[PDB]
Design an enzyme around this catalytic site. Structure first.
Site, PDB file in Angstrom:
ATOM      1  CB  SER A 186      -0.886   0.048   1.149  1.00  0.00           C
ATOM      2  OG  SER A 186      -1.942  -0.577   1.237  1.00  0.00           O
ATOM      3  N   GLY A 207       2.567  -0.150   4.555  1.00  0.00           N
ATOM      4  CA  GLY A 207       2.663  -1.153   3.709  1.00  0.00           C
ATOM      5  C   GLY A 207       2.261  -2.546   4.445  1.00  0.00           C
TER       6      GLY A 207
HETATM    7  C1  NXL Z   1      -2.071  -2.382   1.873  1.00  0.00           C
HETATM    8  O1  NXL Z   1      -0.481  -2.495   1.932  1.00  0.00           O
HETATM    9  N1  NXL Z   1      -2.911  -2.809   1.892  1.00  0.00           N
HETATM   10  C2  NXL Z   1      -4.241  -1.594   2.257  1.00  0.00           C
HETATM   11  C3  NXL Z   1      -4.876  -2.012   3.577  1.00  0.00           C
HETATM   12  N2  NXL Z   1      -4.315  -0.549   4.840  1.00  0.00           N
HETATM   13  O2  NXL Z   1      -3.449  -2.063   5.020  1.00  0.00           O
HETATM   14  S1  NXL Z   1      -1.612  -0.742   5.858  1.00  0.00           S
HETATM   15  O3  NXL Z   1      -2.099   0.366   5.959  1.00  0.00           O
HETATM   16  O4  NXL Z   1      -0.790  -1.394   5.905  1.00  0.00           O
HETATM   17  O5  NXL Z   1      -1.365  -0.460   4.457  1.00  0.00           O
HETATM   18  C4  NXL Z   1      -4.955  -3.487   3.671  1.00  0.00           C
HETATM   19  C5  NXL Z   1      -3.711  -4.398   3.533  1.00  0.00           C
HETATM   20  C6  NXL Z   1      -3.244  -4.031   2.324  1.00  0.00           C
HETATM   21  C7  NXL Z   1      -3.883  -4.550   0.691  1.00  0.00           C
HETATM   22  N3  NXL Z   1      -4.571  -5.822   1.196  1.00  0.00           N
HETATM   23  O6  NXL Z   1      -4.341  -4.329  -0.163  1.00  0.00           O
END
Ligand code: NXL
Length: 262
Positions: free
Chosen positions: A40, A207
């Site tokens: 992310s 992320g």
């Molecule tokens: C990003 O990596 N994502 C979006 C969402 N946020 O989690 S984060 O704040 O660590 O980025 C859920 C996990 C992940 C995804 N599966 O897209």
């Protein structure tokens, strides 16, 4: 726990760290130029690219986006809320950064930024030649070892964040919005923010791919008393597809990196 090599060995995986004190120039590097999955974490730069588009076309942030007939991507806490009537572009940018909203990211890359290719071009145009976004949400999260798709390096991420707050891309109005968004991020309390004293202010973007135990955080850190920011960038991943990530490892790495650049 006293040094980065010991943290990485006990984590059983790969840890990549770059930190820089933008006042003194003191830096710290550990696998800073090796590649890690972005997960992310590209969404902060996506929001900045939307800010730049508005800078170059005043009013873009207030254009409305409608998506009534969409099947919402998992992890869309804001866009699923507003689906019945749409959202302003600026609120999509705020949502993809501060809430890591997946629907918002894909919507912005469908209608404003020209796909993952356009995201990469934006980064390239500010001088970041390591960043590459290749796929959409959620396939960009596969985090396969040896796959350079949807990766960057800890140092490139740090340097691009610094550019975005150091008057090289965004004017001061748009920089201030970007920095308020980062400071208002809702998802980072257990990573870099968990490593800083009470009273310091952190703007960060996390992320978490959900694969290969992959998790990261990058931030600017304001000690107060008008100190220039610290920049910290921390990326981790592991060898087994279904291995879990560990927030506490990122926080431990953050303490080391802060100690060495403060
Ligand atoms: C990003 O990596 N994502 C979006 C969402 N946020 O989690 S984060 O704040 O660590 O980025 C859920 C996990 C992940 C995804 N599966 O897209």
């Amino acid at each position: 726990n006293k040094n980065m090599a010991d943290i990485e060995a006990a984590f059983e995986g790969r840890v990549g760290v770059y930190a820089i004190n933008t006042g003194s120039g003191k830096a710290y590097s550990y696998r800073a130029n090796e590649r890690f999955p972005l997960c992310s974490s590209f969404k902060a730069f996506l929001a900045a690219a939307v800010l730049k588009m508005d800078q170059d076309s005043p009013g873009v942030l207030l254009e409305k986006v409608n998506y009534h007939n969409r099947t919402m991507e998992p992890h869309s806490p804001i866009t699923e809320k507003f689906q019945s009537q749409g959202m302003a572009v600026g609120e999509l940018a705020a949502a993809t950064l501060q809430y890591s909203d997946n629907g918002a990211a894909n919507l912005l890359m469908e209608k404003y930024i020209k796909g993952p290719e356009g995201m990469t071009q934006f980064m390239n145009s500010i001088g970041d030649t390591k960043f590459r976004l290749d796929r959409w949400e959620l396939d960009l999260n596969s985090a396969i070892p040896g796959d350079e798709r949807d990766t960057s390096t800890p140092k490139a991420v740090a340097e691009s964040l610094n550019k975005l707050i150091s008057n090289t891309v965004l004017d001061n109005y748009h920089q201030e919005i970007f920095k308020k968004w980062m400071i208002g991020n809702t998802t980072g309390d257990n990573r870099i923010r968990a490593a800083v004293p009470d009273g310091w202010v952190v703007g960060d973007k996390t992320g978490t791919c959900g694969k290969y135990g992959t998790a990261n955080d990058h931030a600017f850190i304001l000690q107060g008393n008008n100190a220039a920011p610290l920049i910290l960038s921390i990326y981790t991943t592991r060898k087994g597809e279904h291995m879990k990530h560990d927030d506490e490892v990122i926080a431990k790495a953050a303490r080391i990196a802060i100690e060495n650049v403060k």
